[PDB]
Design a protein around this motif. Structure first.
Motif, PDB file in Angstrom:
ATOM      1  N   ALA A 112      35.012  34.436  30.876  1.00  0.00           N
ATOM      2  CA  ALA A 112      34.137  35.535  31.284  1.00  0.00           C
ATOM      3  C   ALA A 112      33.255  35.179  32.476  1.00  0.00           C
ATOM      4  O   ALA A 112      33.074  35.992  33.396  1.00  0.00           O
ATOM      5  CB  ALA A 112      33.266  35.963  30.110  1.00  0.00           C
ATOM      6  N   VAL A 144      40.230  39.522  29.196  1.00  0.00           N
ATOM      7  CA  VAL A 144      39.446  40.243  30.204  1.00  0.00           C
ATOM      8  C   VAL A 144      40.266  41.313  30.919  1.00  0.00           C
ATOM      9  O   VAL A 144      41.352  41.032  31.432  1.00  0.00           O
ATOM     10  CB  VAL A 144      38.832  39.271  31.214  1.00  0.00           C
ATOM     11  CG1 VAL A 144      38.013  40.024  32.214  1.00  0.00           C
ATOM     12  CG2 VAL A 144      37.972  38.278  30.492  1.00  0.00           C
ATOM     13  N   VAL A 200      36.008  41.664  27.041  1.00  0.00           N
ATOM     14  CA  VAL A 200      35.049  42.038  28.069  1.00  0.00           C
ATOM     15  C   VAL A 200      35.746  42.933  29.078  1.00  0.00           C
ATOM     16  O   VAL A 200      36.856  42.621  29.517  1.00  0.00           O
ATOM     17  CB  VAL A 200      34.450  40.809  28.762  1.00  0.00           C
ATOM     18  CG1 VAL A 200      33.437  41.241  29.780  1.00  0.00           C
ATOM     19  CG2 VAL A 200      33.810  39.912  27.747  1.00  0.00           C
TER      20      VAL A 200
END
Lengths: 75, 130
Positions: free
Chosen positions: B38, B93, B61
């Motif tokens: 992240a 992600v 995320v």
């Protein structure tokens, strides 16, 4: 011809008179073509130096706004 | 963080992968950090100066990139994302890219908790809190 109401003030009289012409105003607005009417309206006001561009097109119950002095030539 | 396994289980996993891949002599299992992933994503977007928003979920995320981007921005973004994906894959992600026009098409509006949209002078819409 109805004397049924008597008038407290300028605005009350003015509105009473105005609302009487609408039978005529309707007939003129039925047959004229609105783009002229608006063009003249914007012209007798000096507004924005008399002609200017409009980015946005927005119609404002313009049927009741228009003055008879604007409607007559268009008709 | 998200995996809970013993050494024995990991070895079993290794052996089953080795059975799926008859050309490989062994499979090495390495543990990586989610915070690292992240962080490198957000650092890349700052380094490219792209505007974005971040959203967190229990298992992922999401970075939302939306609006009237310029052609240089679109080029940079496409290159960066294409580089990242090849390193970390797409499971954890996600990058959402959206070209879109200015909000509410250039009407004027009152954006408080009691907001509304003017359609035209003399006309109110009251569609939703803005």
């Amino acid at each position: 011809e109805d004397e049924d109401v008597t008038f407290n003030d300028i605005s009350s009289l003015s509105k009473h008179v105005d609302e009487g012409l609408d039978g005529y105003r309707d007939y003129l607005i039925k047959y004229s073509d609105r783009e002229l009417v608006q063009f003249f309206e914007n012209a007798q006001l000096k507004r924005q130096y008399g002609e200017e561009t409009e980015t946005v097109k927005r119609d404002k119950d313009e049927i009741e706004k228009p003055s008879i002095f604007a409607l007559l030539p268009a008709y | 963080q998200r995996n809970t396994m013993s050494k024995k289980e990991l070895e079993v996993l290794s052996q089953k992968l080795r059975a799926l891949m008859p050309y490989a002599d062994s499979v090495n299992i390495t543990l990586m950090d989610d915070v690292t992933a992240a962080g490198q994503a957000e650092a890349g977007l700052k380094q490219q100066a792209l505007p974005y928003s971040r959203r967190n979920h229990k298992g992922g995320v999401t970075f939302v990139i939306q609006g009237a981007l310029d052609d240089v921005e679109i080029l940079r973004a496409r290159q960066f994302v294409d580089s990242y994906y090849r390193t970390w894959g797409g499971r954890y992600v996600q990058f959402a890219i959206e070209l879109k026009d200015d909000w509410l098409k250039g009407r004027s509006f009152q954006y408080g908790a009691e907001g509304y949209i003017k359609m035209s002078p003399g006309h109110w819409y009251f569609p939703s809190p803005l």
